[PDB]
Amino acid sequence: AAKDVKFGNDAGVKMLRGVNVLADAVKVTLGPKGRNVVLDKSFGAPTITKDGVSVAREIELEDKFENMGAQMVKEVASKANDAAGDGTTTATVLAQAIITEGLKAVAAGMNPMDLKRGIDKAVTVAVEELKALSVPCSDSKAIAQVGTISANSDETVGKLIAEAMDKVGKEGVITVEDGTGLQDELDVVEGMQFDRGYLSPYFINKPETGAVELESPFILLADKKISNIREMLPVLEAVAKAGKPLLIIAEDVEGEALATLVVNTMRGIVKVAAVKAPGFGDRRKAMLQDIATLTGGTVISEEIGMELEKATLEDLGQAKRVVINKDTTTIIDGVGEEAAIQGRVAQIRQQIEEATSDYDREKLQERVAKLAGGVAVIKVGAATEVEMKEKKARVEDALHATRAAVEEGVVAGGGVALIRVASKLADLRGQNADQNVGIKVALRAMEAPLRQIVLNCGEEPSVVANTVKGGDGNYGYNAATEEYGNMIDMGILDPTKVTRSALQYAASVAGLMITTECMVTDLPK
Amino acid sequence: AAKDVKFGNDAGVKMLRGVNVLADAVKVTLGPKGRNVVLDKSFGAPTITKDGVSVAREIELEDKFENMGAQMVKEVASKANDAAGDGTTTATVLAQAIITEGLKAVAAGMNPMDLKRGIDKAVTVAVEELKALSVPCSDSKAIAQVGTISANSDETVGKLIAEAMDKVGKEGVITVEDGTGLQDELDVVEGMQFDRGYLSPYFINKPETGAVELESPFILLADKKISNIREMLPVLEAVAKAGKPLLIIAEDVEGEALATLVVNTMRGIVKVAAVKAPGFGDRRKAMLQDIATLTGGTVISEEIGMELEKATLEDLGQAKRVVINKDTTTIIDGVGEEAAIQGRVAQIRQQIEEATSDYDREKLQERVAKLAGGVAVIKVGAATEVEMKEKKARVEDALHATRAAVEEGVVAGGGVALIRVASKLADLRGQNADQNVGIKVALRAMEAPLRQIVLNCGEEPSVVANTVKGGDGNYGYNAATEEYGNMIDMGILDPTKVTRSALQYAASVAGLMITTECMVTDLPK
Amino acid sequence: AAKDVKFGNDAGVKMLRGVNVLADAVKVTLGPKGRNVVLDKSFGAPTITKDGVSVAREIELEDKFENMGAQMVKEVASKANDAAGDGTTTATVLAQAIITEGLKAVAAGMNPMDLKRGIDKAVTVAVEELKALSVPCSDSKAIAQVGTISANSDETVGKLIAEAMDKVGKEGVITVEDGTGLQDELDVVEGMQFDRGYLSPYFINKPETGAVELESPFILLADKKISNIREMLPVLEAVAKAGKPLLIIAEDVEGEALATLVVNTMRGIVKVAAVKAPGFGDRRKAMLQDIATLTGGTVISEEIGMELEKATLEDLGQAKRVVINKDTTTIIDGVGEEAAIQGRVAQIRQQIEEATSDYDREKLQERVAKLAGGVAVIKVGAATEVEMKEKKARVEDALHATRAAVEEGVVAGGGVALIRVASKLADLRGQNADQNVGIKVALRAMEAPLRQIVLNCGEEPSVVANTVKGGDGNYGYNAATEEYGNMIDMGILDPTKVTRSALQYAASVAGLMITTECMVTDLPK
Amino acid sequence: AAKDVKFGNDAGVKMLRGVNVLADAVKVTLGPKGRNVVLDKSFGAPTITKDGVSVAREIELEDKFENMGAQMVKEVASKANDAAGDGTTTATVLAQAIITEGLKAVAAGMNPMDLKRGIDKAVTVAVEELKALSVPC
Ligand SMILES: Nc1ncnc2c1ncn2[C@@H]1O[C@H](COP(=O)(O)OP(=O)(O)OP(O)(O)=S)[C@@H](O)[C@H]1O
Ligand SMILES: Nc1ncnc2c1ncn2[C@@H]1O[C@H](COP(=O)(O)OP(=O)(O)OP(O)(O)=S)[C@@H](O)[C@H]1O
Ligand SMILES: Nc1ncnc2c1ncn2[C@@H]1O[C@H](COP(=O)(O)OP(=O)(O)OP(O)(O)=S)[C@@H](O)[C@H]1O
Ligand SMILES: [K+]
Ligand SMILES: [K+]
Ligand SMILES: [K+]
Ligand SMILES: [K+]
Ligand SMILES: [Mg+2]
Ligand SMILES: [Mg+2]
Ligand SMILES: [Mg+2]
Ligand SMILES: [Mg+2]
DSSP: OOEEEEEHHHHHHHHHHHHHHHHHHHHTTOSTTOOOEEEOOSSSSOEEEOOHHHHHHHOOOSSHHHHHHHHHHHHHHHHHHHHHSSOHHHHHHHHHHHHHHHHHHHHTTOOHHHHHHHHHHHHHHHHHHHHHHOBOOOSHHHHHHHHHHHTTSOHHHHHHHHHHHHHHOTTSOEEEEOOSSSSOEEEEESOEEESOOBSSTTOOSBTTTTBEEEESOEEEOEESEEOOGGGTHHHHHHHHGGGOOEEEEESEEOHHHHHHHHHHGGGTSSOEEEEEOSSOHHHHHHHHHHHHHHHTOOOEEGGGTOOSTTOOTTTSEEEEEEEEOSSOEEEEEEOOOHHHHHHHHHHHHHHHHSOOSHHHHHHHHHHHHHHHHOEEEEEOOOSSHHHHHHHHHHHHHHHHHHHHHHHHOEEETTTHHHHHHHHHTTTOOOSSHHHHHHHHHHHHHTTHHHHHHHHHHTSOHHHHHHHHHHSOTTEEEETTTTEEEETTTTTOEEEHHHHHHHHHHHHHHHHHHHTEEEEEEEOOO | OOEEEEEHHHHHHHHHHHHHHHHHHHHTTOSTTOOEEEEOOSSSSOEEEOOHHHHHHHOOOSSHHHHHHHHHHHHHHHHHHHHHSSOHHHHHHHHHHHHHHHHHHHHTTOOHHHHHHHHHHHHHHHHHHHHHHOBOOOSHHHHHHHHHHHTTSOHHHHHHHHHHHHHHOTTSOEEEEOOSSSSOEEEEESOEEESOOBSSTTSOSBTTTTBEEEESOEEEOEESEEOOGGGTHHHHHHHHGGGOOEEEEESEEOHHHHHHHHHHGGGTSSOEEEEEOSSOSHHHHHHHHHHHHHHTOOOEEGGGTOOSTTOOTTTSEEEEEEEEOSSOEEEEEESOOHHHHHHHHHHHHHHHHSOOSHHHHHHHHHHHHHHHHOEEEEEOOOSSHHHHHHHHHHHHHHHHHHHHHHHHOEEETTTHHHHHHHHHTTTOOOSSHHHHHHHHHHHHHTTHHHHHHHHHHTSOHHHHHHHHHHSOTTEEEETTTTEEEETTTTTOEEEHHHHHHHHHHHHHHHHHHHTEEEEEEEOOO | OOEEEEEHHHHHHHHHHHHHHHHHHHHTTOSTTOOEEEEOOSSSSOEEEOOHHHHHHHOOOSSHHHHHHHHHHHHHHHHHHHHHSSOHHHHHHHHHHHHHHHHHHHHTTOOHHHHHHHHHHHHHHHHHHHHHHOBOOOSHHHHHHHHHHHTTSOHHHHHHHHHHHHHHOTTSOEEEEOOSSSSOEEEEESOEEESOOBSSTTOOSBTTTTBEEEESOEEEOEESEEOOGGGTHHHHHHHHGGGOOEEEEESEEOHHHHHHHHHHGGGTSSOEEEEEOSSOHHHHHHHHHHHHHHHTOOOEEGGGTOOSTTOOTTTSEEEEEEEEOSSOEEEEEEOOOHHHHHHHHHHHHHHHHSOOSHHHHHHHHHHHHHHHHOEEEEEOOOSSHHHHHHHHHHHHHHHHHHHHHHHHOEEETTTHHHHHHHHHTTTOOOSSHHHHHHHHHHHHHTTHHHHHHHHHHTSOHHHHHHHHHHSOTTEEEETTTTEEEETTTTTOEEEHHHHHHHHHHHHHHHHHHHTOOEEEEEOOO | OOOOOOOHHHHHHHHHHHHHHHHHHHHTTOSTTOOOEEEOOSSSSOEEEOOHHHHHHHOOOSSHHHHHHHHHHHHHHHHHHHHHSSOHHHHHHHHHHHHHHHHHHHHTTOOHHHHHHHHHHHHHHHHHHHHHHOOOO
């Protein structure tokens, strides 16, 4: 269709207006004193939230160009979300701060490419500096502390997570399920988790977690691509009976077949979800087999002249439960017999012996760890279904936060970590004045999170920022009590991973907008 | 429908406005310092690109006359793209420069026909001069260098391409496929490539390459035209099973039958693609047979009273993979047995002996080369599916660039080649003044690429242009480092072929617009 | 529907405006220095052409009355096209010139009927004078020259045409087909051509020539009208097999049956084309038989109690190829055996002996000539399918032009012929002053072609016209070199037939418009 | 009072339009076959003339910029009139011819100062040549 095309300044003011509407709606929810945002629904009472992602998802603007700016920066939150699962609001205020001052510098005549280079250099050094200030979370005591703090001071949740990580290792798989009633339960079952998410949304039966969950499902392990539904018809019907859901783990499920699965499972006509097989090439087949040995299934490969049509419920694997995210599939408690599984382990164990290459050695050790590691399951205590469902949510969050903490450590929260990093880069310089302006744009933006947290408290941003900058180390502002103090001692911590991600994604998208010269969109008609 | 009709100047300003919108949106993406263009999408985040072709595809204007001018010059990019697979942005800025000054001259009262003639003469001489300045790329060391440079200094990709061309010759067929995992692979398989593209788009399943790709498909070799789908019904269904795609290599697939194929394969209902048989007349049948021998299929000609209805999956040929462009079909690794194939080679080999005419001799040698040459296959290394998919892209581009370099050599990049050529034509004259103006219009336009690259850097076009013209040889401006130097020593090269094509297509379309007196389009109703 | 009705002047200005938009869009393409016209398409790049007929086809106007004027004069081009196959643009500029001055005279109060009479008288005398100046093209040398000139100076095409006409006579049938590859081929086969075109478009499988072409088809020779498809069902299916197209040569194919044929052959469902049988009355049957004897078929007449239902593929005639225009059917190389054919010739040969009437004698001689003359076939050389298809086009045109040249000779091109004729009629007078004005309007219009050619060159019409008129004979202006000289010596010739047709049709349509008093069209609603 | 200010091309088209109205009205009266121009009067019958000066005096345009162009070229005729007392119409058609093509060249991107310099050189030499051709009286 005919297009509307805008260049330079005209495009720039539009983009800025768009990010401002999105960022302003989102940032009011930041921190302990975050304000509520009311989101209208077509039916019933409006949604009232303090969750940044919930607000961002609703934002769409009428002006086509302004809307592009909002959708672009919306990418910041989503990516930060996918990478760290927290700090999407922080990332959005950082992006708005960099974009605002960056576009001003552009309008002033400064070189966009140089501004971006300066911003990027500052971020590169800032991340290194962030790592230097990071405090490790390696021993179980630390893990327990972070867990407790993330569970609203519930030492119970802290001990649970610490024990779970002591079982399967801090790098191991850990899940949480409803409890049998009163008292928590922690047991390790035969399970595995690989990096492959659902082949499309819709499969998502629990939008609360934006994931797909199946109970006691059958697992089809096809070593090939599936384009024609015909091949599935025989097995899908065999699964239609026994009233159990089906998990498709094939090399890939293309359009035709996938489209059908999305439509049928959409009408309650058999619950089926598909995900790509882990790895690629040779190791792929070997890994597809590990899943079979674990779930007690049979790989259906064309290499041995096998057909999906000639596949019965006996070939299918099975597990008590499977969960899949946007990019992760976890099989909990497989039917496979410890004899077959443990044997498979022994095999791969020798593979490592005969390993003539570190790479092949690494890849093999990865499989044994997955197949021999299992999956720790945390069954949340109870005393009434309501409280149980609640504690479960806390455990889930605490667990998520502790996991991130374990990966990259923790830093002072309340935005002070970024403020401390900014002060350490006061002498950073680039190749020219425009690059230096870019550097300053970024260091200035690093104060935005703390400032917005203070603003939401109803206090003066410049005053608090000035005071915090006046001190050093973990000295910061506790927005809940409105008192200054040591952020670590007051238990206000952020996983270094979410702070780093919020900053990198904000800068990444800001850099793109700052160097955008033209925008194309459909004519408002 | 009622038409709007415009003449002379009225039409001219409309066209100019149209090419300016397109050229201006596209040209900001030129060179190492190209800026981003944001393209709106109906769903999700907008597309942010620095790729000229991506931008051009989106351009369509509201005013019908302005739109015509944009679509006309859009043909420049597309043709240059089809011919050299690069330099579409350069071609567009050259076209804008010629059109702008040429239309100005027309408005000044100069003769359009003479202007065009002068422009054409300049381009004709410029192309000859471009060839003179071209540096060959014949030995494997040169091929390796070009390949390395085109692969972002990846000496690995350079060696690969060099070795691949050393196997099948620099004029041989080369393909790249995903690797089995870590470490690259180079092996020659039984394959062939003929000059025939898809009988219509849509078949294109990979718009990234604007090509059609089929894996382990069946190949129907019908020696006749196919108009009625009825004939196909039996075979299409046989192919429906076995779950394999079908490649139709007939004399031609006309409307009725073709239309159906486009619709069915559009609905996932059996994946089928059709292309015309290579050559024409007698040799056609002989060649169609070479394909059969290679894929292990059976030609279904009416001459022997054979019907497509009475054709089973046993008659169909087969290969591990086939790729088809806008005008090229390549069959990779055919089922045919070396016995039959090598035997077929021997036959044609004697044919050359009994050859009583050079023409027939040439044609026969062409077949043997194709049937005996094979197809070099490059399997990209790995170490994680992500990196593997990435390196594969680099190898693809590097290969494409190197291939072009091998055909016509290389010249200084950054727009200096065209600038050196222009200076060498300062004394070029035509049959009259208007023709001389035409010549100058062209010579002036030849500076546009370098000027736009500099402009995108944020530097001063005239100053850099002036300085570069001041020197000579490969002296140029490195836009990445913003330093002057020897373009070749700095590794900034352009295949002579893409520079030549960009210039010729730009002049071609510009000459047509310059000599346009009337425009007809639908009334805006 | 309610109508809008206009009279006199009101209608006249509308008509004039309409012919002016059409004529102005078309005339810019006249001559060697013709300008391009861009025609918008719904998809892809617009069409850029210098072809008058392509431009005219697109012209439709919004104002209903203006549109009528455009569609009316559009009939000039089409009729001149159908009659001579060239000079449609020349015809259109002559028409605009006559209409413009004619309508001015009407507005000035002159009698429309007298104006028309005067224009008609001038044209009548002009055509006679044109025949007087016409130079013959009888000998093979002349034929070769005209052919060479018409083939863009390709002396090869010139020899071919000359040889082809030397074989079957300059009045004989000649066709051109794709070559076998390199080197031209000329062979006389058993063929025939009669004056009957397709019974409707659509059958046209090659819009490039706007004709229908069938290869090795079956020929149904039904001596009666065909209204019900039922009769055909049996034979159509018999032809469904053997995979061969069918040519229906019946007394006529009416609605019901014809409509079906158009729809089925439209869906690839059997390729069939229908044309009326040559002649009428008695001779018709006798001729329909000549076709049978030639194609080896059997006439299915109801006179002998024969039914189309009881007709097998054995009754149908057959030939290697048949081509049918808007009003011509040519059967190339029929299956008929020289025994039957030559015998048939002997029969008709005696018929001429027993002829008691010149008319019957003439009609009989016509049949023997057609049945005994055959068809010279020209197979264009090759060396790549592309060049072959191109040269074929040139030979086609060169042949078409030479044919016309042979019929009425040639005259000086560049519009000097009409200029010479006009000057010879300077004393022509009519019955009254108004008729004299009509005469002058026509003589004046005769200068229009030369003037427009010069105008498209960018030169001054009045200066060149004045100079050409100053000389005499073949003295004219060479628009390609912009030099005066002898048009004949410079090889700038026009078939007298196209010049005569352009003038007569232009005057014809102009006379109708000049004598139109009222216009009726639908209300713009 | 507040002013309207125009630059380059915008100004050029306005001027050209203004001189064209004046020149076109004036030049129809040139030579033995000059045509009549009717000039309205507030009272009585209009003035019918073939005299260029009479026509030029009446020309004033509504658009302020176009009017400036007319008044400027009007200076040509008056000065030629004061200097030689004849040829004001000839001076006006020469002015329009130079202005028209000169402005076209400017719009084509040619240097205004150089165009003027060239025109000046041609006139300087043309005047010398005119003296050579001149027959004494
Ligand atoms: N008492 C406190 N004083 C100051 N800052 C605090 C306090 N408690 C938490 N925070 C900080 O508030 C920020 C987190 O606020 P949230 O509202 O959860 O936003 P976000 O994590 O950036 O984005 P969401 O949660 O994905 S929307 C972190 O910087 C915390 O350190
Ligand atoms: N460091 C450099 N300095 C100067 N010019 C460079 C440099 N690197 C690449 N170039 C030139 O930039 C041009 C290629 O830029 P691109 O943006 O890829 O446009 P294009 O190839 O003309 O069109 P696309 O790629 O089809 S959009 C060529 O003229 C290169 O020689
Ligand atoms: N060198 C030449 N000098 C002058 N007239 C020429 C020359 N070459 C061709 N012509 C004339 O150009 C006319 C033919 O021009 P075309 O553009 O083909 O138009 P047309 O044949 O009148 O109509 P079309 O072709 O059906 S659109 C004839 O009058 C030719 O004699
Ligand atoms: K919040
Ligand atoms: K680019
Ligand atoms: K033409
Ligand atoms: K006068
Ligand atoms: Mg949070
Ligand atoms: Mg490029
Ligand atoms: Mg013609
Ligand atoms: Mg005087």
